[PDB]
C-alpha cells in the first residue's frame, strides 16, 4: 500500500482582470476542489484574485513545504500565456499587452519541483491561453479549455473541473484518472478532436490522491510552517460584544477562501429603556483597501458573496473582505453602536476595537 508523509494543496483562481477579459469559471472551480481535496486529507490554501507579488509568494510558500514523501497538488485557473516553448501564469495586475517578466514562469517551477523528494506532486493549470535521479514523481495536466456552463444557480462551472470532479475521489492511480478525463474531454462536445488536455507523467510506481497518510512526524524546521498551512482553514470564532447601555451585538465569521472572509454582525439584545440602535463594522487595516461604501449591507450578493449564502444567518448586516492575502498583523476592526433612550432625543455612539488575530491565509509567515 503507498502511503503519503502528508498531503498539502495550494489552488489559485485569477478571475478579476485589471486589463484582462474577466473570468467566470475559477470562482466554483476553485471552491469545488478545495472541498474535494479537503475530503481526501488535504491541508489546502485556495486563493482568488493574486497579483504577481501574492502569486510568487504563495508559490514559494508551497514549495517549501514538500519534504520528502509528501503528497503535494498546486492547481492554477487563470489566464495563461504561451512564448519560446514556455508557458506562464497570468496574475490579476499584469499589464496588457502581455509580458514574461510580469508572470509566473511554468517550467521553472517544473524545475523546482523536480528537486523535491515527494512521495507525489501533482501540477494542474486550466488556462485560457493566449499566444503574439532521484523521483520527484510529478504529474503535470495542462488544460487549454478555459468556456464554461451557466447552472440553475446562475454560477458557472468549468469543463475541466466538471470531469476531474467526478473522478478526483475514486482510489486508482492518478495517470489513470487523468487518462480518463482526458477520454471524457475527447468525446465532450466542446472540445472533441482538438488539443485541450496534455499530461505528464514521471510516476514510476502507483500513488493516488487516495493513498492514507503514514508516519506523519514533522521535523524540527518544517514544524511552525506546517502548523500555519494546517490552520489557514480556522476561522474566527463568534463573539459577543457586550456595550455599556446593555445592547449586545453578534459577531459571526465565514469563509469562500483562504484569502475571503465575510464578517456579519446583528443585535442579539437591546434593553426596554434603549428605543433605536444600528450596529456597524469600521476602520479595517489600511491593507484590505475595503470602502465603507461596501462593508454593512442588507444581504450577502451586495457584497459580492454567493458561494456561502446555505451557511450565513439571515437579517445581518455583511461584509466581505476578499483581499486578506494582504494582511501583515492581527486583524482589528471596530464595531460602532448609535443609540436612543426612550423618551430622549439624542442619539448616543459608543464604539470598541475587535482583535480576530491572523485569520485564514493571515496564519501564513509569508512575504507580504
Same mark, same amino acid.
Given at each position: 500500500?503507498?502511503? $503519503? ?17 474577466? +473570468? ?8 469545488? +476542489? ?8 488535504? &491541508?489546502?490554501?485556495? +486563493?482568488?484574485?493574486? #497579483? ?12 517549501? %513545504? =514538500? ?5 503535494? =497538488? ?18 490579476? !495586475? ?10 509566473? /514562469?511554468?517550467?521553472?517551477? =517544473?524545475?523546482?519541483?523536480?528537486? &523535491? ?12 491561453? &493566449?499566444?503574439? @535521479?532521484?523521483? $520527484? ?24 473541473? @466538471? ?11 492518478? #495517470?489513470?484518472? =487523468?487518462? *480518463? ?6 468525446? /465532450? ?15 514510476? *510506481? ?9 508516519? #506523519? ?13 494546517? &490552520? $489557514? ?53 489600511? !491593507? %484590505? ?46 464595531? /460602532? ?12 455612539? !459608543? ?18
Amino acid at each position: 500500500q503507498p502511503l $503519503a508523509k502528508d498531503k498539502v494543496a495550494l489552488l489559485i483562481g485569477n478571475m478579476n482582470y485589471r486589463e484582462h477579459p474577466k +473570468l467566470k469559471a475559477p470562482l466554483v472551480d476553485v471552491y469545488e +476542489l478545495t472541498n474535494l481535496l479537503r475530503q481526501l486529507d488535504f &491541508k489546502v490554501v485556495s +486563493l482568488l484574485d493574486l #497579483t504577481e507579488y501574492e502569486m510568487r509568494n504563495a508559490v514559494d510558500e508551497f514549495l517549501l %513545504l =514538500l519534504d520528502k514523501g509528501v503528497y503535494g =497538488l498546486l492547481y492554477y485557473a487563470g489566464h495563461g500565456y504561451e512564448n519560446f516553448g514556455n508557458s506562464f501564469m497570468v496574475p490579476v !495586475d499584469a499589464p496588457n499587452p502581455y509580458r514574461s517578466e510580469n508572470c509566473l /514562469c511554468v517550467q521553472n517551477i =517544473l524545475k523546482l519541483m523536480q528537486e &523535491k523528494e515527494t512521495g507525489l506532486n501533482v501540477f494542474l493549470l486550466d488556462m485560457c491561453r &493566449k499566444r503574439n @535521479k532521484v523521483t $520527484a514523481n510529478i504529474v503535470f495536466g495542462y488544460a487549454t479549455c478555459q468556456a464554461f456552463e451557466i447552472q440553475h444557480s446562475g454560477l458557472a462551472n468549468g469543463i475541466f473541473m @466538471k470531469f476531474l470532479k467526478d473522478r478526483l475521489l475514486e482510489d486508482k492511480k492518478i #495517470t489513470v484518472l =487523468l487518462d *480518463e478525463v482526458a477520454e471524457d474531454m475527447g468525446k /465532450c462536445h466542446l472540445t472533441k478532436g482538438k488539443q485541450a488536455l496534455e499530461i505528464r507523467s514521471s510516476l514510476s *510506481e502507483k500513488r493516488a490522491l487516495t493513498d492514507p497518510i503514514q508516519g #506523519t512526524e514533522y521535523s524540527a524546521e518544517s514544524l511552525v510552517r506546517n502548523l500555519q498551512w494546517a &490552520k $489557514a482553514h480556522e476561522l474566527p470564532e463568534s463573539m459577543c460584544l457586550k456595550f455599556d447601555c446593555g445592547v449586545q451585538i453578534q459577531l459571526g465569521f465565514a469563509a469562500e477562501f483562504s484569502n475571503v472572509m465575510i464578517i456579519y454582525t446583528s443585535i442579539v439584545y437591546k434593553p426596554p429603556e434603549i428605543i433605536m440602535c444600528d450596529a456597524y463594522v469600521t476602520d479595517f487595516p489600511l !491593507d %484590505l483597501d475595503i470602502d465603507p461604501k461596501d462593508a454593512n449591507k442588507g444581504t450577502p450578493e451586495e457584497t459580492g458573496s454567493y458561494l456561502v449564502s446555505k451557511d450565513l444567518p439571515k437579517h445581518c448586516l455583511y461584509t466581505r473582505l476578499s483581499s486578506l492575502q494582504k494582511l501583515k498583523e492581527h486583524l482589528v476592526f471596530t464595531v /460602532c453602536l448609535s443609540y436612543q433612550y426612550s423618551g430622549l432625543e439624542d442619539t448616543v455612539e !459608543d464604539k470598541q476595537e475587535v482583535n480576530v488575530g491572523k485569520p485564514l491565509i493571515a496564519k501564513l509567515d509569508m512575504h507580504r
